[model samples]
Target: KGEELFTGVVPILVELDGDVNGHKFSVRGEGEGDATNGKLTLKFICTTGKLPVPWPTLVTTLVLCFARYPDHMKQHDFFKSAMPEGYVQERTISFKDDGYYKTRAEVKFEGDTLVNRIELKGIDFKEDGNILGHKLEYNSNSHNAYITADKQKNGIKSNFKIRHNVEDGSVQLADHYQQNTPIGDGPVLLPDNHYLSTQNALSKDPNEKRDHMVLLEFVTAAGITLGMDELYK
Candidate 1:
C-alpha cells in the first residue's frame, strides 16, 4: 500500500511500480473520498507523468546576471496592471543566459483549482547593434492537459485541452506543440527540453522573419487572472 504525505496540503509521491507506454509510471491521490470540499481535497487532483522541477529560482538567478535589456520594457507592467484585481504577476524575466525570456502567471479559485498563463519572449541580437523580438504564449485552465498557444491579432492567445484521469483521477499535461511549426521563436518546451525558445521576423523576409530563441522558464504562486483577462478589452 502507498503512504500519504502532507506539506500543509496533501502530497503523495507515487513511485513507479512498473513501466507503461515506454515510460516509468505511477499515480498519486485518487479523487474518491480524498477530493471534496476544502483546500486539502485539491491534492487529490494530482499530476501524472514526469514531474516538472520548479523553474523560478533558476530563472530569477539568470535575470540578475544579465544587463536587464529593455530596462524600460513595460509590456510586463502593462500586462500585470491590465490583469483584474486579486490576480498577480508571478514572475517575468529573461531566460536562456539572457537570450530569451519567460513569464508564468496564475489565479487560484477557492484555494483549489488554478488558471495559468505562460508567456515566452524571444530576442535577436544583430552585429549592427540592433535587436528583434517575438513572443509565444501558453495558457491552461488546469495544470493537467494539452496546453495550447495560438497566434492572435496582437500578441498570442492560449488555452489547454485537459482531462481528469479516471484511474488515479490525476490531471495530465500532454506535449501538444511537439509537432507544431515554429510560429515565432519556438515552442515553450524545446526538443532538448532544457530551455525555452523564441523567434522574431526579419526585413529581408519582411514577411519571412528571422528565427531566434531564449532558454528560460518561470513559475509563480500568485493570482493575476481577472485583471489580465480584462486587459483583452
Candidate 2:
C-alpha cells in the first residue's frame, strides 16, 4: 500500500551551546514541521556569565541572519509588500570587483523532507571597491540548514560551513572554518559541539530598551516576533 511519507508534524529537536562574546550560553529549542511548513521555539537554560544581550534577542538576530532571506521571501504572495522599489527582479547581480553571477537555487520535496538547495557564484561582499568573491551552496533538508561558502580575496582563502552537524541532536550555529591567510599558512579544522538545556532562566532586563532588527521591520513590526503558524497565513 502506498502511503504519504510525512503525515503530520515532525518535531525537530535543537540545542544552542556555544560562546557569545566569550561567555558560554545554551538554548534549547524545538521545531515542528508539517509537510509544507514548520515552527520553532527556544528557551534559554543556564549561562556562565552575564550576556551582552538577552537570550531571546541574541537568538532572534542569529535566526534572521542565518535562516531568513528577505529577497528570497519577496517572491511569495504573503510577502508582496516586501518588493523593494528600483530593485530589478533578476537572476544575475553585478559587482564592481568581481564578475557578474547568478543563482541556481532549487526547491522540492524529498520523502518526508522539504529540501532547498541554494547555489550561486558571485561576490559575497563588497566594500570600497573590494569584494570577497565566493562560490556558495547551501542545502536545507528538513530540520537542517547547511551552508558552505568558499571565499577568497587577494590570495586569502577559506571554506566556511555552518550548521554542518545537524544530524546530531542539537542545531549548532557555529561554523566549520577551513582557511589560509595571505601568506598561505593553513587548512585548520574547527568543529562546534553544543546543545541547549532548559535548566537556567533566560536573562531579561526591564531598564534596557529593545533593539530592532531593521530589515525584519518591513515584514512585521520592529521587536515583534512571528510564530511559525503565521507564515501559513
Candidate 3:
C-alpha cells in the first residue's frame, strides 16, 4: 500500500488562479527554491478584472510564518556566556522563543482586482516549532496554513491569508470575496483565526487611512512546486 505518512508538514511553492472580490488574478509563491536556503521570491499579478492600473506590480521575496503545534519539552540548562558587567555567570534560555516564523510579502491591485504572492521557509510539518496554536491542543488538519507581515490597530489584526491546499488542487483563494460566488469561496469561512475576522464590510475609500487587503488561498503547483513561470505571467 502507498500513502503519505505525514500531511501538512512539507515546504511548498504554490500558484493560484481565481477571482478576488469580483476581480481576477494569478499568483505564485517561490517557497520551494531557496527552501531553507534563504527566503522565497513571491511574484504574480492580475490578468483580468483590470482596475485602472498599468503592468503587473512586483513586491519582493516574501517571508512565511508557518503555524504549527508541538509536544512537551523538559527544561534544560540552555546556558549562555556574558561579558558585560550586567551579565551573570549563566542564563536560562527557552528553546521555544524563536525560529518558528518568517516573513516576506508583496501585493498589487486596484479597484478591479488584487493579486498578492507570499512565500515561506523552514517547515518540516513534523517540526513542533513550526506548528501554530497551543502545543498538544489538537486541531483540524485543514489549518496547516501560514501568516505574514501584518498591521494591528485597536487589536484589529489585518493580514493576508494564503493557505496552501496540499490536498485540493482546484482550490481558489477566495474566502474574503464577500459575494462568495467564486470557485472555492463557498462553504468556507476565513481559515486563519489568529488574524481578525473580516465579515464586516471594510471601507475602500481612498480618503480614509483604513488598510485594504484581499483574503486569499493558494493551491500548490503540480502538487509540490510553484509551477512554471508562464502560469503566473
Candidate 4:
C-alpha cells in the first residue's frame, strides 16, 4: 500500500491485430520489480510470439526508448530515443515517411471481449523538433505512460489508474502533460500502473507470468520493453 507496487517478477507482452496502418507487433515478455525500494528491470522472454524477426529487435529498440526516461517516459522529448540511434534504423517503413509512427490506422472495436482497441498516430517525422511520431491509444486508455496525457484532459480519476494497452497487453500510462511538454503534474511520480498496492502480490518465483507490462532497466530505469519476468540480475 505504500510506494511499493510491483516486485519480484512480472510477466508482460505486446499484442497487436494489424491496425489499418499496417503495423502489428504482438509478443510476450516479463520483468523483475521491487516496490519497496522502487527498482525494476525488464526484457523479452522466449514466449514472445507472432512477432516478425527484425521487428523484435526494432521493438526492443522502442522499449529502450521508453526506458531512457524512467522518471519522465511519456513525453515526446523523453521518446526521442523511442527509435534506434542509427539513421537507417530510424525509418522501417519505406512506402511512407521514415519516423516513429509514420502512418495512421483505422479503429477496430471488440466489445464482445475485453477492452481491445489500439489507435497509433505519429508521422514518423520530427515536427517543431519533437518526435510527433509515437502516439498509441489502447484499451480506450493507457493513454501515455502514467496517465493518458490527452485522456487526462478528457477523463481519468485516480492518478494511478492505468490507461494499459489491451491489444498486445503492453503498458502505456497517462502523464499530466503540460504545454510544449509531453508530461506535467499530478499522480505521475512513477510510471503509470507501476505503483502497486502490494509487493510480491505478483509472481515471487521471478519466473511466473503474472501480467503483461512495459518494464524499465532496474534502478537505472533505462529503456522500456515488453518483459517476461524478473529474469535480470
Q: Rate the local accuracy (lDDT) of all candidates.
A: 0.22, 0.26, 0.22, 0.27
lDDT of 1 by residue, 1-233 (tens): 01011112322111112221222222232111111111211111113443221111122211110111121222221122222221322233222222322333332122332222223333332212111221212112223212122233222222223221222333322212221222233122211111122111111113422221122222211222335545564
Most lDDT-accurate candidate: 4
Scored by lDDT, model 4 comes in at 0.27
Expressed as tens digits, the lDDT of each residue in 20-130 for candidate 4 is: 124344433434334223344444432334332222112312221112233343322222221111011111222122233322211111221111122233333433221
What alpha-carbon RMSD in Å does predicted model 1 have with respect to the real structure?
21.4
Reference-based TM-score of each model: 0.20, 0.25, 0.20, 0.28
Q: Which stretches of candidate 1 lie over 4 Å from their true place?
A: 1-86, 95-98, 102-104, 125-233
lDDT by residue (1-233, candidate 3, tens digit) is: 00111122333343334332233344443222121221232323333333211111111122122211111100100000000001111111111332212222223222222222333232222232212221321111132222221122111122233222212232212111101011211121122222211111111234523222121222211112233663555
CA error at residue 198 for candidate 1, angstroms: 28
The regions of model 3 sitting more than 4 angstroms off are 1-11, 32-65, 73-233
Cα deviation in Å at residue 150, candidate 4?
9.2
Minimal lDDT window, size 10, model 3:
74-83
Q: What's the CA RMSD for each of the models? A: 21.4, 19.3, 24.0, 16.4
Off by over 4 Å in 4: 7-23, 35-97, 102-216, 219-233
| Model 1 global lDDT (CA atoms, 0 to 1) | 0.22
User: Which rank order by lDDT, best down to worst?
Assistant: 4, 2, 1, 3
Report the C-alpha lDDT of model 2 over 114-192, residue by residue, as the tens digit: 3323333333333222222112211221222222212332211222223312323433332222221121223311212
Give the Å error, residue 121, model 1: 2.2
